[PDB]
Design a protein around this ligand. Structure first.
Ligand SMILES: [Mg+2]
Ligand code: NA
Ligand code: NA
Length: 172
């Protein structure tokens, strides 16, 4: 089961992912991305590891507007937790890989792109992932059109009801 959550910036995709993680408990393995307050973005894993990987203070060749992205800081936390999530999820179908966000800042990492492609196209694992509403990178387009996936456009009008639909589709 692949749940792909999309929607406008600020609509609450991370917030929803966090609710999903709490409900899933030990089933959920991966990471989400929280705003630093806005001056940047922090990766937070399901093990509570945290690091600012994109910031208005960071000098970088990898830029999204005024945010400098440190690919190495992102990878330090993202890659090992996703490699673990993928190993565990292949053996235990109760596990759900968590990836917030497959977005422009994260996609500067080749290691992340390759691992995301491997995970998303593997029929044998469950995933909850977010993508931006615009096709800001070819991998975002690829994931938006992923065959068999559940694609949810998160809005202010379904924000407070959509959780149970998602949780039912995943095993109770
Ligand atoms: Mg978010
Ligand atoms: Na959003
Ligand atoms: Na949010």
């Amino acid at each position: 089961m692949k749940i792909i959550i999309t929607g406008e910036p600020g609509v609450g995709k991370t917030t929803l992912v966090k609710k999903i993680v709490e409900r899933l408990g030990k089933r959920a393995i991966g990471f989400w991305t929280e705003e630093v307050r806005r001056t940047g973005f922090r990766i937070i894993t399901t093990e509570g590891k945290k690091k600012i990987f994109s910031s208005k203070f960071f000098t970088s060749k990898k830029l999204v507007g005024s945010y400098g992205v440190n690919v190495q800081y992102f990878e330090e936390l993202a890659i090992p937790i996703l490699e673990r999530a993928y190993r565990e999820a292949k053996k235990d179908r109760r596990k759900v890989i968590i990836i917030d966000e497959i977005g422009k800042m994260e996609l500067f990492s080749k290691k992340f792109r390759d691992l995301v492609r491997q995970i998303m196209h593997d029929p044998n694992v469950n995933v909850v992932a977010t993508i931006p509403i615009r096709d800001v990178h070819p991998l975002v387009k690829e994931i938006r059109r992923l065959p068999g996936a559940v694609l949810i456009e998160l809005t202010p009008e379904n924000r407070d009801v959509i959780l149970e639909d998602i949780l039912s589709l995943l095993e109770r």
